[PDB]
Write a protein that binds this ligand. Sequence first.
Ligand SMILES: Nc1ncnc2c1ncn2[C@H]1C[C@H](O)[C@@H](COP(=O)(O)O)O1
Length: 248
Amino acid sequence: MDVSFRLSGATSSSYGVFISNLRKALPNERKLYDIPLLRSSLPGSQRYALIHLTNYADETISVAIDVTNVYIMGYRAGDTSYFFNQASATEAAKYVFKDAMRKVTLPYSGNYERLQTAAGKIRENIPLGLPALDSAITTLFYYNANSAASALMVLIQSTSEAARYKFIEQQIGKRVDKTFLPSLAIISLENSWSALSKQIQIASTNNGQFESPVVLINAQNQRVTITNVDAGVVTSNIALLLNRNNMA
Ligand SMILES: Nc1ncnc2c1ncn2[C@H]1C[C@H](O)[C@@H](COP(=O)(O)O)O1
């Protein structure tokens, strides 16, 4: 199931509609604490969703996402496809963007450590917000090795991370005509998705208590140790759970 988002005429609410549509497009059979639990394994024909993004200038790219972990596999710009250099993306290439004439394998996987090294910048210093997503679309449509890694981190955060956390969706969407640097709280949520997903599943079989705590960074940049499902991040923020059998 594919979804789209257009930057021209975009508003905070239209970005919210987009991210809600993206979450809905990801298959799920179960929910834990009313949070959809992503599937651990899906056949190729059900494993990918396409996100179609158009910038202010009416240029469009299509983004392939693995619905089991919301990872970006690659994207298409006109007649060229670009895929990350990672096992799951190589597999994705057999199913999506099959008709592109030229196929580029990027020099890195989509892991943040590789992307920040390639971009020569850490996530905290890369602007986010709707105008930043516009620029990332332009940058990737007119692909250049020098600028792609940074744009890909904007893209991943504006799609994958926003879908996983209401907080991230809300902070990016409120920047309609301005941009902002993400706080340590955002970095922490991104870093902690797998561990949180894991502990929330364990909690469902352990009276709501985590087996191991998860350390997050709050609004005051303080380390907070999360131990159960009544914590605010579980009750009102995390929006998708990575399946325990799909963590590595
Ligand atoms: N392809 C793709 N899309 C989106 N986010 C990604 C991707 N590859 C890695 N990552 C991010 C997800 C986690 O913050 C970190 C761990 O990746 P790992 O390398 O799996 O341990 O890297």
